[PDB]
Amino acid sequence: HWGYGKHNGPEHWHKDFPIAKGERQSPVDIDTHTAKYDPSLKPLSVSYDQATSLRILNNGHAFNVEFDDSQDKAVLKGGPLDGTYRLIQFHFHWGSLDGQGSEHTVDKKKYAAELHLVHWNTKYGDFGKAVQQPDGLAVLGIFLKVGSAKPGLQKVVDVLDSIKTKGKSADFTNFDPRGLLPESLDYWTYPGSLPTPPLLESVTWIVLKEPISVSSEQVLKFRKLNFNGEGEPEELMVDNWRPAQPLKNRQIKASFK
Ligand SMILES: [Zn+2]
Protein backbone atom coordinates (compact mmCIF):
# COMPACT_ATOMS: atom_id res chain seq x y z
CA HIS A 1 0.00 0.00 0.00
CA TRP A 2 1.54 3.28 1.12
CA GLY A 3 5.06 3.76 2.43
CA TYR A 4 8.03 6.11 2.29
CA GLY A 5 9.93 4.56 -0.63
CA LYS A 6 9.67 6.96 -3.61
CA HIS A 7 7.07 4.95 -5.54
CA ASN A 8 4.60 4.84 -2.65
CA GLY A 9 5.83 7.77 -0.56
CA PRO A 10 4.20 10.92 0.76
CA GLU A 11 4.15 12.55 -2.67
CA HIS A 12 1.81 9.77 -3.84
CA TRP A 13 -0.52 9.62 -0.82
CA HIS A 14 -3.05 12.16 -2.11
CA LYS A 15 -4.19 9.77 -4.83
CA ASP A 16 -5.55 7.38 -2.24
CA PHE A 17 -6.12 9.93 0.53
CA PRO A 18 -7.19 13.26 -0.92
CA ILE A 19 -7.13 14.84 2.56
CA ALA A 20 -3.35 14.90 2.06
CA LYS A 21 -3.80 18.31 0.44
CA GLY A 22 -6.07 19.39 3.29
CA GLU A 23 -6.18 22.65 5.22
CA ARG A 24 -4.62 21.34 8.41
CA GLN A 25 -2.04 18.79 7.54
CA SER A 26 1.03 17.86 9.61
CA PRO A 27 3.88 18.17 10.14
CA VAL A 28 4.78 21.81 9.73
CA ASP A 29 7.73 24.10 10.17
CA ILE A 30 7.63 25.99 13.44
CA ASP A 31 8.82 29.53 12.75
CA THR A 32 9.75 30.99 16.13
CA HIS A 33 9.63 34.47 14.68
CA THR A 34 5.89 34.09 14.02
CA ALA A 35 4.90 31.63 16.74
CA LYS A 36 3.30 33.92 19.28
CA TYR A 37 3.19 33.51 23.03
CA ASP A 38 -0.37 32.93 24.19
CA PRO A 39 -1.00 33.86 27.84
CA SER A 40 -4.27 31.94 27.93
CA LEU A 41 -2.44 28.71 27.20
CA LYS A 42 -2.08 26.83 30.48
CA PRO A 43 0.66 24.42 31.66
CA LEU A 44 0.59 20.83 30.46
CA SER A 45 -0.36 18.13 32.92
CA VAL A 46 1.26 14.77 32.17
CA SER A 47 0.29 12.00 34.59
CA TYR A 48 2.28 8.95 33.57
CA ASP A 49 2.87 7.57 37.08
CA GLN A 50 0.86 4.42 36.54
CA ALA A 51 1.32 3.89 32.82
CA THR A 52 1.01 0.23 31.88
CA SER A 53 2.96 -0.82 28.79
CA LEU A 54 1.66 -4.00 27.10
CA ARG A 55 3.80 -4.76 24.11
CA ILE A 56 5.99 -3.55 21.29
CA LEU A 57 5.48 -4.26 17.63
CA ASN A 58 6.75 -3.54 14.16
CA ASN A 59 3.85 -2.48 11.95
CA GLY A 60 5.84 -1.94 8.81
CA HIS A 61 6.01 1.85 9.18
CA ALA A 62 7.63 2.23 12.60
CA PHE A 63 7.58 0.38 15.88
CA ASN A 64 4.79 1.14 18.36
CA VAL A 65 4.93 0.68 22.10
CA GLU A 66 1.34 0.03 23.13
CA PHE A 67 -0.29 0.87 26.47
CA ASP A 68 -3.39 -0.31 28.33
CA ASP A 69 -5.89 2.49 27.80
CA SER A 70 -8.90 1.01 29.72
CA GLN A 71 -8.62 3.52 32.51
CA ASP A 72 -7.12 6.94 33.18
CA LYS A 73 -3.71 5.49 34.09
CA ALA A 74 -1.53 7.58 31.75
CA VAL A 75 -3.22 10.81 30.73
CA LEU A 76 -2.52 14.20 29.23
CA LYS A 77 -4.56 17.19 30.32
CA GLY A 78 -4.34 20.94 30.43
CA GLY A 79 -2.46 23.02 27.88
CA PRO A 80 -4.80 23.71 24.97
CA LEU A 81 -6.87 20.62 25.75
CA ASP A 82 -10.52 20.62 26.85
CA GLY A 83 -10.73 17.18 28.47
CA THR A 84 -8.73 14.08 29.40
CA TYR A 85 -6.62 12.26 26.85
CA ARG A 86 -5.38 8.68 27.40
CA LEU A 87 -2.02 7.47 26.17
CA ILE A 88 -2.42 4.59 23.69
CA GLN A 89 1.00 4.26 22.04
CA PHE A 90 4.24 5.96 21.25
CA HIS A 91 6.53 5.57 18.24
CA PHE A 92 9.35 7.44 16.54
CA HIS A 93 10.17 8.77 13.07
CA TRP A 94 13.84 8.89 12.16
CA GLY A 95 16.27 9.36 9.30
CA SER A 96 18.98 7.40 7.52
CA LEU A 97 21.49 9.99 8.77
CA ASP A 98 21.75 12.07 11.99
CA GLY A 99 21.03 15.34 10.16
CA GLN A 100 17.49 14.29 9.29
CA GLY A 101 14.65 12.33 10.76
CA SER A 102 12.21 14.62 12.53
CA GLU A 103 8.84 15.48 11.00
CA HIS A 104 8.44 18.88 12.53
CA THR A 105 11.21 21.44 12.06
CA VAL A 106 12.16 24.49 14.09
CA ASP A 107 13.20 27.42 11.93
CA LYS A 108 13.70 24.84 9.17
CA LYS A 109 16.15 22.85 11.30
CA LYS A 110 15.69 19.10 11.44
CA TYR A 111 16.45 16.79 14.33
CA ALA A 112 17.69 13.22 14.18
CA ALA A 113 14.36 11.73 15.27
CA GLU A 114 10.94 12.63 16.67
CA LEU A 115 8.97 10.82 19.33
CA HIS A 116 5.19 10.88 19.20
CA LEU A 117 3.18 9.94 22.28
CA VAL A 118 -0.40 9.44 20.95
CA HIS A 119 -3.41 10.12 23.15
CA TRP A 120 -7.18 10.00 22.56
CA ASN A 121 -10.02 12.08 24.03
CA THR A 122 -11.79 9.99 26.68
CA LYS A 123 -15.31 11.43 25.77
CA TYR A 124 -15.38 9.31 22.58
CA GLY A 125 -15.08 6.01 24.40
CA ASP A 126 -12.24 4.52 22.36
CA PHE A 127 -9.45 5.37 19.94
CA GLY A 128 -11.41 4.13 16.89
CA LYS A 129 -14.19 6.65 17.48
CA ALA A 130 -11.87 9.42 18.62
CA VAL A 131 -9.61 9.34 15.54
CA GLN A 132 -12.56 10.55 13.39
CA GLN A 133 -13.26 13.73 15.44
CA PRO A 134 -11.53 17.13 15.15
CA ASP A 135 -10.66 17.15 18.87
CA GLY A 136 -10.15 13.40 19.04
CA LEU A 137 -6.40 13.05 19.38
CA ALA A 138 -3.51 14.81 21.13
CA VAL A 139 0.03 14.00 20.18
CA LEU A 140 3.01 15.06 22.24
CA GLY A 141 6.01 15.48 19.95
CA ILE A 142 9.55 15.45 21.35
CA PHE A 143 12.68 16.03 19.27
CA LEU A 144 15.74 13.83 19.64
CA LYS A 145 19.28 15.13 19.17
CA VAL A 146 22.42 12.99 19.09
CA GLY A 147 24.70 13.26 22.13
CA SER A 148 24.70 11.41 25.41
CA ALA A 149 22.62 8.26 25.75
CA LYS A 150 19.12 8.48 27.18
CA PRO A 151 18.95 5.88 29.96
CA GLY A 152 15.14 5.67 29.77
CA LEU A 153 15.32 4.71 26.08
CA GLN A 154 17.64 1.71 26.54
CA LYS A 155 14.90 -0.79 27.46
CA VAL A 156 13.31 -0.08 24.08
CA VAL A 157 16.61 -0.39 22.25
CA ASP A 158 17.27 -3.73 23.97
CA VAL A 159 14.36 -5.45 22.21
CA LEU A 160 14.43 -4.15 18.65
CA ASP A 161 16.18 -7.21 17.19
CA SER A 162 13.21 -9.29 18.35
CA ILE A 163 10.75 -7.25 16.23
CA LYS A 164 13.04 -6.67 13.25
CA THR A 165 10.45 -7.36 10.55
CA LYS A 166 6.84 -6.36 9.87
CA GLY A 167 4.17 -8.10 11.92
CA LYS A 168 6.58 -9.11 14.68
CA SER A 169 5.42 -8.38 18.23
CA ALA A 170 6.83 -8.89 21.74
CA ASP A 171 5.62 -8.50 25.32
CA PHE A 172 6.95 -5.25 26.70
CA THR A 173 5.82 -4.57 30.25
CA ASN A 174 7.00 -2.22 32.97
CA PHE A 175 8.17 0.51 30.68
CA ASP A 176 7.99 4.04 32.13
CA PRO A 177 7.47 6.71 29.48
CA ARG A 178 8.45 9.38 32.01
CA GLY A 179 12.05 8.47 31.18
CA LEU A 180 11.62 9.92 27.65
CA LEU A 181 10.51 13.42 28.65
CA PRO A 182 12.73 16.50 28.77
CA GLU A 183 13.11 18.61 31.91
CA SER A 184 10.94 21.41 30.62
CA LEU A 185 7.35 21.11 29.36
CA ASP A 186 7.36 24.40 27.42
CA TYR A 187 5.60 23.82 24.10
CA TRP A 188 4.16 25.06 20.84
CA THR A 189 0.70 23.92 19.78
CA TYR A 190 -1.42 23.99 16.58
CA PRO A 191 -4.27 22.02 15.02
CA GLY A 192 -3.06 19.37 12.60
CA SER A 193 -3.45 15.83 11.36
CA LEU A 194 -2.06 12.33 11.50
CA PRO A 195 1.16 12.47 9.39
CA THR A 196 0.47 8.97 7.97
CA PRO A 197 -2.60 7.70 6.10
CA PRO A 198 -5.48 8.05 6.71
CA LEU A 199 -4.10 11.58 7.43
CA LEU A 200 -7.22 12.60 9.39
CA GLU A 201 -7.36 16.18 10.66
CA SER A 202 -8.12 15.16 14.21
CA VAL A 203 -4.90 16.00 16.01
CA THR A 204 -4.02 18.74 18.44
CA TRP A 205 -0.25 18.90 18.25
CA ILE A 206 1.85 19.73 21.28
CA VAL A 207 5.50 19.91 20.33
CA LEU A 208 7.97 20.34 23.18
CA LYS A 209 10.64 23.02 22.85
CA GLU A 210 13.39 21.08 24.67
CA PRO A 211 14.92 18.10 22.82
CA ILE A 212 16.11 14.96 24.54
CA SER A 213 19.54 13.51 23.90
CA VAL A 214 20.11 9.94 22.67
CA SER A 215 23.38 8.29 21.65
CA SER A 216 24.57 7.43 18.17
CA GLU A 217 24.48 3.83 19.36
CA GLN A 218 20.78 3.95 20.36
CA VAL A 219 19.56 5.58 17.11
CA LEU A 220 21.61 3.03 15.16
CA LYS A 221 19.46 0.32 16.62
CA PHE A 222 16.37 1.99 15.11
CA ARG A 223 17.87 1.96 11.63
CA LYS A 224 18.40 -1.82 11.83
CA LEU A 225 14.69 -2.63 11.70
CA ASN A 226 12.99 -3.61 8.44
CA PHE A 227 10.01 -2.12 6.57
CA ASN A 228 9.61 -5.48 4.87
CA GLY A 229 8.16 -8.65 6.35
CA GLU A 230 10.07 -11.83 7.16
CA GLY A 231 11.72 -13.13 4.00
CA GLU A 232 10.69 -10.39 1.61
CA PRO A 233 13.43 -8.27 0.00
CA GLU A 234 15.13 -6.39 2.84
CA GLU A 235 14.21 -2.71 3.14
CA LEU A 236 15.81 -1.01 6.16
CA MET A 237 13.37 1.10 8.16
CA VAL A 238 14.79 4.57 7.64
CA ASP A 239 13.40 7.98 6.67
CA ASN A 240 9.89 7.18 7.85
CA TRP A 241 9.03 10.86 8.10
CA ARG A 242 6.64 13.10 6.12
CA PRO A 243 7.98 16.43 4.88
CA ALA A 244 6.62 19.69 6.26
CA GLN A 245 3.20 20.67 4.89
CA PRO A 246 1.81 24.17 4.25
CA LEU A 247 0.66 26.02 7.39
CA LYS A 248 -2.06 27.79 5.41
CA ASN A 249 -4.43 29.66 7.73
CA ARG A 250 -3.24 28.31 11.04
CA GLN A 251 -1.27 30.05 13.74
CA ILE A 252 1.19 28.23 15.95
CA LYS A 253 0.93 29.27 19.61
CA ALA A 254 3.76 29.16 22.15
CA SER A 255 3.31 28.45 25.87
CA PHE A 256 6.40 30.44 26.71
CA LYS A 257 7.68 33.99 26.39
ZN1 LIG B 1 4.20 9.77 14.43
CSV table of C-alpha atoms and ligand atoms in Angstrom, one decimal:
chain,number,residue,atom,x,y,z
A,1,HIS,CA,0.0,0.0,0.0
A,2,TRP,CA,1.5,3.3,1.1
A,3,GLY,CA,5.1,3.8,2.4
A,4,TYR,CA,8.0,6.1,2.3
A,5,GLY,CA,9.9,4.6,-0.6
A,6,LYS,CA,9.7,7.0,-3.6
A,7,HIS,CA,7.1,4.9,-5.5
A,8,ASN,CA,4.6,4.8,-2.6
A,9,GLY,CA,5.8,7.8,-0.6
A,10,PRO,CA,4.2,10.9,0.8
A,11,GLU,CA,4.2,12.5,-2.7
A,12,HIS,CA,1.8,9.8,-3.8
A,13,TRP,CA,-0.5,9.6,-0.8
A,14,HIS,CA,-3.1,12.2,-2.1
A,15,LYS,CA,-4.2,9.8,-4.8
A,16,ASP,CA,-5.6,7.4,-2.2
A,17,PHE,CA,-6.1,9.9,0.5
A,18,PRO,CA,-7.2,13.3,-0.9
A,19,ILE,CA,-7.1,14.8,2.6
A,20,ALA,CA,-3.4,14.9,2.1
A,21,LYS,CA,-3.8,18.3,0.4
A,22,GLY,CA,-6.1,19.4,3.3
A,23,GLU,CA,-6.2,22.6,5.2
A,24,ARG,CA,-4.6,21.3,8.4
A,25,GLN,CA,-2.0,18.8,7.5
A,26,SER,CA,1.0,17.9,9.6
A,27,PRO,CA,3.9,18.2,10.1
A,28,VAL,CA,4.8,21.8,9.7
A,29,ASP,CA,7.7,24.1,10.2
A,30,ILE,CA,7.6,26.0,13.4
A,31,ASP,CA,8.8,29.5,12.8
A,32,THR,CA,9.7,31.0,16.1
A,33,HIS,CA,9.6,34.5,14.7
A,34,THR,CA,5.9,34.1,14.0
A,35,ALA,CA,4.9,31.6,16.7
A,36,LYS,CA,3.3,33.9,19.3
A,37,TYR,CA,3.2,33.5,23.0
A,38,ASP,CA,-0.4,32.9,24.2
A,39,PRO,CA,-1.0,33.9,27.8
A,40,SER,CA,-4.3,31.9,27.9
A,41,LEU,CA,-2.4,28.7,27.2
A,42,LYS,CA,-2.1,26.8,30.5
A,43,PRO,CA,0.7,24.4,31.7
A,44,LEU,CA,0.6,20.8,30.5
A,45,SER,CA,-0.4,18.1,32.9
A,46,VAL,CA,1.3,14.8,32.2
A,47,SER,CA,0.3,12.0,34.6
A,48,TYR,CA,2.3,8.9,33.6
A,49,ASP,CA,2.9,7.6,37.1
A,50,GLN,CA,0.9,4.4,36.5
A,51,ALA,CA,1.3,3.9,32.8
A,52,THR,CA,1.0,0.2,31.9
A,53,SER,CA,3.0,-0.8,28.8
A,54,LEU,CA,1.7,-4.0,27.1
A,55,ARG,CA,3.8,-4.8,24.1
A,56,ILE,CA,6.0,-3.5,21.3
A,57,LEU,CA,5.5,-4.3,17.6
A,58,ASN,CA,6.8,-3.5,14.2
A,59,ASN,CA,3.8,-2.5,11.9
A,60,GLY,CA,5.8,-1.9,8.8
A,61,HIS,CA,6.0,1.8,9.2
A,62,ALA,CA,7.6,2.2,12.6
A,63,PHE,CA,7.6,0.4,15.9
A,64,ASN,CA,4.8,1.1,18.4
A,65,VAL,CA,4.9,0.7,22.1
A,66,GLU,CA,1.3,0.0,23.1
A,67,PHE,CA,-0.3,0.9,26.5
A,68,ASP,CA,-3.4,-0.3,28.3
A,69,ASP,CA,-5.9,2.5,27.8
A,70,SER,CA,-8.9,1.0,29.7
A,71,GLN,CA,-8.6,3.5,32.5
A,72,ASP,CA,-7.1,6.9,33.2
A,73,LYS,CA,-3.7,5.5,34.1
A,74,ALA,CA,-1.5,7.6,31.7
A,75,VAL,CA,-3.2,10.8,30.7
A,76,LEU,CA,-2.5,14.2,29.2
A,77,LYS,CA,-4.6,17.2,30.3
A,78,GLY,CA,-4.3,20.9,30.4
A,79,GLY,CA,-2.5,23.0,27.9
A,80,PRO,CA,-4.8,23.7,25.0
A,81,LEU,CA,-6.9,20.6,25.8
A,82,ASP,CA,-10.5,20.6,26.8
A,83,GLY,CA,-10.7,17.2,28.5
A,84,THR,CA,-8.7,14.1,29.4
A,85,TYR,CA,-6.6,12.3,26.9
A,86,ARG,CA,-5.4,8.7,27.4
A,87,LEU,CA,-2.0,7.5,26.2
A,88,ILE,CA,-2.4,4.6,23.7
A,89,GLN,CA,1.0,4.3,22.0
A,90,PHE,CA,4.2,6.0,21.2
A,91,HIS,CA,6.5,5.6,18.2
A,92,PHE,CA,9.4,7.4,16.5
A,93,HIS,CA,10.2,8.8,13.1
A,94,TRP,CA,13.8,8.9,12.2
A,95,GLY,CA,16.3,9.4,9.3
A,96,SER,CA,19.0,7.4,7.5
A,97,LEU,CA,21.5,10.0,8.8
A,98,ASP,CA,21.7,12.1,12.0
A,99,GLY,CA,21.0,15.3,10.2
A,100,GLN,CA,17.5,14.3,9.3
A,101,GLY,CA,14.7,12.3,10.8
A,102,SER,CA,12.2,14.6,12.5
A,103,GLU,CA,8.8,15.5,11.0
A,104,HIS,CA,8.4,18.9,12.5
A,105,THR,CA,11.2,21.4,12.1
A,106,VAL,CA,12.2,24.5,14.1
A,107,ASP,CA,13.2,27.4,11.9
A,108,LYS,CA,13.7,24.8,9.2
A,109,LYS,CA,16.2,22.9,11.3
A,110,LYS,CA,15.7,19.1,11.4
A,111,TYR,CA,16.4,16.8,14.3
A,112,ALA,CA,17.7,13.2,14.2
A,113,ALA,CA,14.4,11.7,15.3
A,114,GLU,CA,10.9,12.6,16.7
A,115,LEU,CA,9.0,10.8,19.3
A,116,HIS,CA,5.2,10.9,19.2
A,117,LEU,CA,3.2,9.9,22.3
A,118,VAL,CA,-0.4,9.4,21.0
A,119,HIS,CA,-3.4,10.1,23.2
A,120,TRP,CA,-7.2,10.0,22.6
A,121,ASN,CA,-10.0,12.1,24.0
A,122,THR,CA,-11.8,10.0,26.7
A,123,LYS,CA,-15.3,11.4,25.8
A,124,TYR,CA,-15.4,9.3,22.6
A,125,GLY,CA,-15.1,6.0,24.4
A,126,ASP,CA,-12.2,4.5,22.4
A,127,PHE,CA,-9.4,5.4,19.9
A,128,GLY,CA,-11.4,4.1,16.9
A,129,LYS,CA,-14.2,6.7,17.5
A,130,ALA,CA,-11.9,9.4,18.6
A,131,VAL,CA,-9.6,9.3,15.5
A,132,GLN,CA,-12.6,10.6,13.4
A,133,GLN,CA,-13.3,13.7,15.4
A,134,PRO,CA,-11.5,17.1,15.2
A,135,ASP,CA,-10.7,17.1,18.9
A,136,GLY,CA,-10.1,13.4,19.0
A,137,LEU,CA,-6.4,13.0,19.4
A,138,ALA,CA,-3.5,14.8,21.1
A,139,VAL,CA,0.0,14.0,20.2
A,140,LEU,CA,3.0,15.1,22.2
A,141,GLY,CA,6.0,15.5,19.9
A,142,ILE,CA,9.5,15.4,21.3
A,143,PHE,CA,12.7,16.0,19.3
A,144,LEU,CA,15.7,13.8,19.6
A,145,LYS,CA,19.3,15.1,19.2
A,146,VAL,CA,22.4,13.0,19.1
A,147,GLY,CA,24.7,13.3,22.1
A,148,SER,CA,24.7,11.4,25.4
A,149,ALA,CA,22.6,8.3,25.8
A,150,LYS,CA,19.1,8.5,27.2
A,151,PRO,CA,18.9,5.9,30.0
A,152,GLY,CA,15.1,5.7,29.8
A,153,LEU,CA,15.3,4.7,26.1
A,154,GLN,CA,17.6,1.7,26.5
A,155,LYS,CA,14.9,-0.8,27.5
A,156,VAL,CA,13.3,-0.1,24.1
A,157,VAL,CA,16.6,-0.4,22.3
A,158,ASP,CA,17.3,-3.7,24.0
A,159,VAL,CA,14.4,-5.5,22.2
A,160,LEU,CA,14.4,-4.2,18.6
A,161,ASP,CA,16.2,-7.2,17.2
A,162,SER,CA,13.2,-9.3,18.4
A,163,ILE,CA,10.7,-7.3,16.2
A,164,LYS,CA,13.0,-6.7,13.2
A,165,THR,CA,10.4,-7.4,10.6
A,166,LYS,CA,6.8,-6.4,9.9
A,167,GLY,CA,4.2,-8.1,11.9
A,168,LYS,CA,6.6,-9.1,14.7
A,169,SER,CA,5.4,-8.4,18.2
A,170,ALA,CA,6.8,-8.9,21.7
A,171,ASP,CA,5.6,-8.5,25.3
A,172,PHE,CA,7.0,-5.3,26.7
A,173,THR,CA,5.8,-4.6,30.2
A,174,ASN,CA,7.0,-2.2,33.0
A,175,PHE,CA,8.2,0.5,30.7
A,176,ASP,CA,8.0,4.0,32.1
A,177,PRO,CA,7.5,6.7,29.5
A,178,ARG,CA,8.4,9.4,32.0
A,179,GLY,CA,12.0,8.5,31.2
A,180,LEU,CA,11.6,9.9,27.7
A,181,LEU,CA,10.5,13.4,28.7
A,182,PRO,CA,12.7,16.5,28.8
A,183,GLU,CA,13.1,18.6,31.9
A,184,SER,CA,10.9,21.4,30.6
A,185,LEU,CA,7.3,21.1,29.4
A,186,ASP,CA,7.4,24.4,27.4
A,187,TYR,CA,5.6,23.8,24.1
A,188,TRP,CA,4.2,25.1,20.8
A,189,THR,CA,0.7,23.9,19.8
A,190,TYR,CA,-1.4,24.0,16.6
A,191,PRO,CA,-4.3,22.0,15.0
A,192,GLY,CA,-3.1,19.4,12.6
A,193,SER,CA,-3.4,15.8,11.4
A,194,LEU,CA,-2.1,12.3,11.5
A,195,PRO,CA,1.2,12.5,9.4
A,196,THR,CA,0.5,9.0,8.0
A,197,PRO,CA,-2.6,7.7,6.1
A,198,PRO,CA,-5.5,8.0,6.7
A,199,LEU,CA,-4.1,11.6,7.4
A,200,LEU,CA,-7.2,12.6,9.4
A,201,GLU,CA,-7.4,16.2,10.7
A,202,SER,CA,-8.1,15.2,14.2
A,203,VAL,CA,-4.9,16.0,16.0
A,204,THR,CA,-4.0,18.7,18.4
A,205,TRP,CA,-0.2,18.9,18.2
A,206,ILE,CA,1.9,19.7,21.3
A,207,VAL,CA,5.5,19.9,20.3
A,208,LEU,CA,8.0,20.3,23.2
A,209,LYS,CA,10.6,23.0,22.9
A,210,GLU,CA,13.4,21.1,24.7
A,211,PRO,CA,14.9,18.1,22.8
A,212,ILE,CA,16.1,15.0,24.5
A,213,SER,CA,19.5,13.5,23.9
A,214,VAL,CA,20.1,9.9,22.7
A,215,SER,CA,23.4,8.3,21.7
A,216,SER,CA,24.6,7.4,18.2
A,217,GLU,CA,24.5,3.8,19.4
A,218,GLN,CA,20.8,4.0,20.4
A,219,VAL,CA,19.6,5.6,17.1
A,220,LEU,CA,21.6,3.0,15.2
A,221,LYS,CA,19.5,0.3,16.6
A,222,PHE,CA,16.4,2.0,15.1
A,223,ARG,CA,17.9,2.0,11.6
A,224,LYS,CA,18.4,-1.8,11.8
A,225,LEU,CA,14.7,-2.6,11.7
A,226,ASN,CA,13.0,-3.6,8.4
A,227,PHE,CA,10.0,-2.1,6.6
A,228,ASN,CA,9.6,-5.5,4.9
A,229,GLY,CA,8.2,-8.7,6.4
A,230,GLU,CA,10.1,-11.8,7.2
A,231,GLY,CA,11.7,-13.1,4.0
A,232,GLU,CA,10.7,-10.4,1.6
A,233,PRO,CA,13.4,-8.3,0.0
A,234,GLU,CA,15.1,-6.4,2.8
A,235,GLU,CA,14.2,-2.7,3.1
A,236,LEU,CA,15.8,-1.0,6.2
A,237,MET,CA,13.4,1.1,8.2
A,238,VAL,CA,14.8,4.6,7.6
A,239,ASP,CA,13.4,8.0,6.7
A,240,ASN,CA,9.9,7.2,7.8
A,241,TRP,CA,9.0,10.9,8.1
A,242,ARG,CA,6.6,13.1,6.1
A,243,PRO,CA,8.0,16.4,4.9
A,244,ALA,CA,6.6,19.7,6.3
A,245,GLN,CA,3.2,20.7,4.9
A,246,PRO,CA,1.8,24.2,4.2
A,247,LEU,CA,0.7,26.0,7.4
A,248,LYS,CA,-2.1,27.8,5.4
A,249,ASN,CA,-4.4,29.7,7.7
A,250,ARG,CA,-3.2,28.3,11.0
A,251,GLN,CA,-1.3,30.1,13.7
A,252,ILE,CA,1.2,28.2,16.0
A,253,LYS,CA,0.9,29.3,19.6
A,254,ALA,CA,3.8,29.2,22.2
A,255,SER,CA,3.3,28.5,25.9
A,256,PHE,CA,6.4,30.4,26.7
A,257,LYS,CA,7.7,34.0,26.4
B,1,ZN,ZN,4.2,9.8,14.4
